[PDB]
Design an enzyme around this catalytic site. Structure first.
Site, PDB file in Angstrom:
ATOM      1  N   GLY B 126       0.777  -1.223   0.000  1.00 10.12           N
ATOM      2  CA  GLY B 126       0.000   0.000   0.000  1.00 10.12           C
ATOM      3  C   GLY B 126       0.811   1.277   0.000  1.00 10.12           C
ATOM      4  O   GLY B 126       1.790   1.407   0.740  1.00 10.12           O
ATOM      5  N   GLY B 127       0.403   2.231  -0.840  1.00 11.18           N
ATOM      6  CA  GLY B 127       0.985   3.558  -0.787  1.00 11.18           C
ATOM      7  C   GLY B 127       0.757   4.240   0.542  1.00 11.18           C
ATOM      8  O   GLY B 127       1.466   5.197   0.873  1.00 11.18           O
ATOM      9  N   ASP B 145       3.637  -7.364   7.445  1.00 12.77           N
ATOM     10  CA  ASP B 145       2.666  -7.923   6.516  1.00 12.77           C
ATOM     11  C   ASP B 145       2.568  -9.427   6.720  1.00 12.77           C
ATOM     12  O   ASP B 145       3.586 -10.107   6.874  1.00 12.77           O
ATOM     13  CB  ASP B 145       3.041  -7.622   5.060  1.00 12.77           C
ATOM     14  CG  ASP B 145       1.857  -7.723   4.119  1.00 12.77           C
ATOM     15  OD1 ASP B 145       0.705  -7.636   4.593  1.00 12.77           O
ATOM     16  OD2 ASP B 145       2.078  -7.900   2.903  1.00 12.77           O
ATOM     17  N   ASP B 178       2.518 -12.615  12.169  1.00 10.59           N
ATOM     18  CA  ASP B 178       1.094 -12.496  12.452  1.00 10.59           C
ATOM     19  C   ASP B 178       0.826 -11.256  13.295  1.00 10.59           C
ATOM     20  O   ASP B 178       1.529 -10.988  14.272  1.00 10.59           O
ATOM     21  CB  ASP B 178       0.594 -13.753  13.165  1.00 10.59           C
ATOM     22  CG  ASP B 178      -0.892 -13.701  13.480  1.00 10.59           C
ATOM     23  OD1 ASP B 178      -1.348 -12.721  14.106  1.00 10.59           O
ATOM     24  OD2 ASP B 178      -1.608 -14.648  13.094  1.00 10.59           O
ATOM     25  N   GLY B 179      -0.201 -10.497  12.907  1.00 15.76           N
ATOM     26  CA  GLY B 179      -0.477  -9.242  13.587  1.00 15.76           C
ATOM     27  C   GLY B 179      -0.889  -9.430  15.034  1.00 15.76           C
ATOM     28  O   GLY B 179      -0.412  -8.725  15.927  1.00 15.76           O
ATOM     29  N   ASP B 196      -4.956  -1.607   9.088  1.00 20.21           N
ATOM     30  CA  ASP B 196      -5.827  -1.816   7.935  1.00 20.21           C
ATOM     31  C   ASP B 196      -6.108  -3.312   7.840  1.00 20.21           C
ATOM     32  O   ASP B 196      -5.311  -4.070   7.282  1.00 20.21           O
ATOM     33  CB  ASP B 196      -5.183  -1.286   6.658  1.00 20.21           C
ATOM     34  CG  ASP B 196      -6.036  -1.538   5.429  1.00 20.21           C
ATOM     35  OD1 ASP B 196      -7.253  -1.764   5.585  1.00 20.21           O
ATOM     36  OD2 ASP B 196      -5.486  -1.513   4.307  1.00 20.21           O
ATOM     37  N   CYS B 251     -12.049  -1.154   3.275  1.00 21.83           N
ATOM     38  CA  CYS B 251     -12.514  -0.846   1.931  1.00 21.83           C
ATOM     39  C   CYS B 251     -13.981  -1.188   1.717  1.00 21.83           C
ATOM     40  O   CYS B 251     -14.575  -0.724   0.737  1.00 21.83           O
ATOM     41  CB  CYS B 251     -11.679  -1.610   0.905  1.00 21.83           C
ATOM     42  SG  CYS B 251     -11.882  -3.400   1.028  1.00 21.83           S
TER      43      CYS B 251
END
Ligand SMILES: [Mg+2]
Ligand SMILES: [Mg+2]
Ligand SMILES: [Mg+2]
Ligand SMILES: [Mg+2]
Ligand SMILES: [Mg+2]
Ligand SMILES: [Mg+2]
Ligand SMILES: [Mg+2]
Ligand SMILES: [Mg+2]
Ligand SMILES: [Mg+2]
Ligand SMILES: [Mg+2]
Ligand SMILES: [Mg+2]
Ligand SMILES: [Mg+2]
Ligand SMILES: [Mg+2]
Ligand SMILES: [Mg+2]
Ligand SMILES: [Mg+2]
Ligand SMILES: [Mg+2]
Ligand SMILES: [Mg+2]
Ligand SMILES: [Mg+2]
Ligand SMILES: [Mg+2]
Ligand SMILES: [Mg+2]
Lengths: 95, 325, 154, 52
Positions: B126-127, B145, B178-179, B196, B251
């Site tokens: 992602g930007g 990630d 893993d988050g 996100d 999103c």
RNA sequence: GAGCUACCUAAAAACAAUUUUAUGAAUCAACUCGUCUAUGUGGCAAAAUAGUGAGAAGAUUUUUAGGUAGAGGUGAAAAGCCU
RNA sequence: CCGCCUGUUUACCAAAAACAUCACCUCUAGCAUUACAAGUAUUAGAGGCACUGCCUGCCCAGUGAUCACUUGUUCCUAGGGACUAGCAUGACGGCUAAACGAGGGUCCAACUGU
RNA sequence: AAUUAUAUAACUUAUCUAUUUUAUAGUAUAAGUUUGAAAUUUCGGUUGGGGUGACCUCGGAGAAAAUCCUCCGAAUGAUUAUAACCUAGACUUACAAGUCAAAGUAAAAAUAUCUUUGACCCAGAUA
């Protein structure tokens, strides 16, 4: 006329002998059809006066269709053979 | 024998029509059609040259107009003209990034303050990172990630835009873990963090046949999305230092995946861990960006952005959460 | 009287070469499966079809037959062929994306009643957007340009 | 994406060798050993072969 | 290979008694067909016998000679029939 | 209950609710010396389908009202003409109808070594 | 489904006649295009038999040298001051393919690190 050509080679037979052919030697491809060639002209010597072509004894190059259908069939013209050329030229010179 | 896209269309029709009422036709048309891109300059070498070139084409930065460290150029209202592809600069970096302008809202409204440290829990290419790196004037940063290949994709982006010297500083560190497990490792570490969660990507879901969450095999994955989203959000809430700020962004348009995810995080944080999260109003931010963005305020939490044909920059949902202690 | 209307609209029917007339008729028969009586009906109703070249008439008919789900009788009754392809795609596609139109299923049924074809095409654009679609004029202009870009890419 | 290109020796000899470059960057030019001349000389991009 | 069978062409033939009428009507022989049960099962019979049943002046049944042939023929379609 | 009815069918395990059938409907064709036919649109070929009456019958361009605008379709250049008044919706159900059947069921009476 | 298809039906261009002042008629045939009556040929494998799913090659981690056992990744990309020719001896391996390298010679003033595809036939490109 249709002219054809073998796809498959025929092995050489020899001097007095003829080749033996196989069923694969019966497959052909068309090299040319003569009817599509550009047309030629016919040479004739007139024997009687005719409109827009000549009077007598003058060689004329005409389309094959006209020469075979009108001039020769009606007797107005003769073939431009060496003998026909010789006779007509002599008459012209004496005249 | 319905295709994956057809399943996505069917599910949206039954639910989105009810949620949005008479606005569903307007939203439906603006999704199946073309999308609008917004060019973001790289600052650095392209700070001056490209920005003048884009302005000569009449493309106008909405952020700059609103202010009247981030400048993103966008076309005029209802203009269909595209942006020329990014070109390689003299200094050795790419001229600009073309991305969906609405995707940048979570950054603009994060209330950046100098001398801070930030984490990107899930930013695959992602930007939102690259744009942040431009905003990270005086900030050490980190990136995590879940995927492996997608992580490498980000690093390549960093090469093209971020100058090495800055990358050499510890501000740029690449990790793939893993988050939720990450939460235990680094509790109360960074002042500001952006989470996100993986969303349904409705726009992409309809357009793209491959790897669509609406496939029959992935039905179990789709059903369990809200629970996993809550887990990631809670982990980030623990990680942020006392007094820190976090923003939840998605999103999708589903009410289930937007309000319930955040409310559970607040409720879970509120009770078990004896912490309080107080939301920060973005109403003034909503009015300032009225000209170039289209939205509806029905949602109790967050500033949901929807796609409109006049301004087809949706759909972006971003909620701001401040941890008071 | 049928000749009178044809002569006025299409003065070149007599001038046109044999080949041109046959192709238009042959497309209507072999490829479109129109009956003998309908063929006379279409030629009299919209004489301009004769001017139109083939491979464009066939596409227009199949667009209605398959994509729009219309039947032979409906096409003849409404003078569908008279309209231009650009108008058909611009209006029909806009309604389909909005969800206001549905291609009839295999069984022949539709969950929602489809709008009448006269409302789609015969009426003015202002009424068509205001009443049939309940949309805004500006949105349609944007959509038309967007559709143009897609065709260019196609 | 990247493209395979053919670098040609500028020594007057026809010697060439294939190299890789990304389509985004400029045309390549390099120093390389030329066997026919037995010296290091410039090789300049002349043609594109394929895209990989 | 159409002397079986399917359909067609030509020339011929049969139909009592009774009630209705004025007929692809009725009762029921001759004649044509084959519902149901038992016997039989290397059987009298490579599909029968004993009873019991359907039609029986009609799209009826029957005789003689001719026609259509297998990438085909014929078919009130059972993918039936063509030694 | 099914099929309108007399008829037909798997010679050698199926005779029926299947096939045909009067009635009704769709499509194709303006013509002679070997079929159709020594015929010509009330005719011929191909195909579908019970009949009968009985409800449900609507893509005519909209509003004014045989009249004006607004539409639509076209051209000639946003202007200027041309055309749309020699016509005018349709799609289901419950129906059955007496008769008839070696068709598939239910029942009463009589009858009997079942 | 793949491969054909002077079954028909259309056209087009020639050819051959008529005319016509270029011109429209036709056509014992050849070459194309459009339709398709037909013709020849086929029905991968492992997952009980189905029904939805999947899966088939290569590399990394556990079981630990078995598995339809438990997981992740790959059919590249970035930077390269540009990495030559020749040649003892070895690894790996059914075959095929794949690894490492002294000495000698040559350019320069020795190795580019990150770390993963495809035989033969048959067609290409240029010099
Ligand atoms: Mg016989
Ligand atoms: Mg006999
Ligand atoms: Mg009698
Ligand atoms: Mg019999
Ligand atoms: Mg009887
Ligand atoms: Mg009887
Ligand atoms: Mg009788
Ligand atoms: Mg049958
Ligand atoms: Mg059968
Ligand atoms: Mg036999
Ligand atoms: Mg019956
Ligand atoms: Mg009977
Ligand atoms: Mg019979
Ligand atoms: Mg039998
Ligand atoms: Mg019977
Ligand atoms: Mg029997
Ligand atoms: Mg029947
Ligand atoms: Mg019976
Ligand atoms: Mg009793
Ligand atoms: Mg050495």
């Amino acid at each position: 006329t249709v002219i054809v050509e073998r796809w498959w080679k025929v092995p050489l037979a020899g001097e007095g002998r003829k080749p033996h052919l196989h069923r694969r030697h019966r497959v052909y491809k068309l090299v040319e059809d003569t009817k599509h060639r550009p047309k030629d002209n016919l040479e004739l010597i007139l024997t009687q006066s005719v409109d827009e072509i000549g009077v007598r004894g003058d060689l004329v190059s005409v389309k094959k269709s006209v020469g075979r259908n009108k001039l020769l069939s009606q007797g107005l013209a003769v073939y431009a053979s060496p003998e026909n050329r010789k006779l007509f030229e002599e008459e012209k010179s004496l005249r | 024998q319905f295709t994956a896209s057809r399943l996505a269309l069917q599910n949206f029709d039954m639910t989105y029509s009810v949620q949005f009422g008479d606005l569903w036709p307007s939203i439906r048309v603006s999704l199946l059609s073309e999308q609008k891109y917004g060019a973001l300059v790289n600052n650095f070498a392209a700070w001056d040259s490209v920005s003048a070139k884009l302005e000569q084409l009449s493309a106008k930065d909405f952020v700059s107009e609103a202010i009247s460290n981030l400048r993103c150029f966008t076309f005029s209202r209802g203009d269909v003209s595209r942006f020329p592809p990014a070109r390689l600069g003299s200094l050795g970096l790419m001229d600009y990034y073309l991305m969906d302008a609405a995707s940048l809202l979570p950054v603009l409204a994060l209330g950046l303050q100098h001398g801070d440290t930030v984490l990107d829990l899930c930013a695959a290419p992602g930007g939102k990172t690259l744009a942040l790196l431009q905003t990270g004037c005086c900030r050490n940063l980190a990136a995590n990630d879940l995927s492996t290949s997608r992580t490498g994709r980000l690093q390549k982006v960093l090469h093209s835009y971020v100058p090495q010297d800055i990358r050499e500083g510890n501000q740029v560190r690449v990790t793939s873990w893993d988050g939720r497990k990450w939460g235990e490792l680094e509790g109360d570490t960074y002042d500001r963090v952006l989470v996100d969660v993986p969303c349904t990507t409705d726009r992409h879901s309809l357009h793209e046949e491959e790897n669509n969450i609406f496939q029959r095999s992935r039905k179990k994955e789709r059903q369990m999305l809200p629970m996993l989203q809550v887990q990631l959000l809670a982990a980030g809430l623990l990680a942020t230092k006392p007094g820190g700020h976090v923003v939840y962004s998605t999103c999708s348009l589903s009410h289930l995946q937007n309000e319930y995810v955040v409310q559970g995080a607040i409720e879970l944080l509120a009770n078990q861990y004896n912490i309080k999260v107080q939301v920060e109003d973005l109403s003034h931010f909503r009015k300032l960006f009225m000209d170039t963005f289209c939205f509806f305020p029905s949602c109790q939490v967050g500033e949901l952005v929807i796609p409109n044909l006049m301004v087809n920059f949706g759909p972006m949902y971003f909620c701001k959460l401040h941890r008071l202690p | 009287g049928k000749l009178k209307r044809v002569l006025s609209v299409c003065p070149e029917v007599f001038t046109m070469h044999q080949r041109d007339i046959d192709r238009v008729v042959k497309v209507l028969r072999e490829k479109c499966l129109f009956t003998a009586q309908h063929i006379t009906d279409v030629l009299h109703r919209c004489p301009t079809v004769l001017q139109e070249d083939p491979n464009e008439l066939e596409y227009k008919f199949q667009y209605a037959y398959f994509r729009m789900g219309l039947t032979h009788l409906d096409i003849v009754r409404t003078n569908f062929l008279q309209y231009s392809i650009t108008k058909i795609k611009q209006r029909h596609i806009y309604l389909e994306r909005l969800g206001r139109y549905q291609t009839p299923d295999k069984k022949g049924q539709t969950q929602i009643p489809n709008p009448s074809l006269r409302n789609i095409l015969r009426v003015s654009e202002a009424e068509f957007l205001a009443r049939t679609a309940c949309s805004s004029v500006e949105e349609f202009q944007v959509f038309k340009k967007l559709l143009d870009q897609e065709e260019e890419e196609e | 994406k990247t493209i395979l290109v053919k670098l040609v020796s500028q020594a007057g000899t026809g010697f060439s060798f294939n190299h890789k470059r990304s389509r985004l960057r400029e045309k390549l030019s390099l120093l390389h050993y030329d066997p026919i001349v037995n010296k290091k000389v410039l090789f300049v991009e002349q043609k594109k072969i394929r895209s990989l």
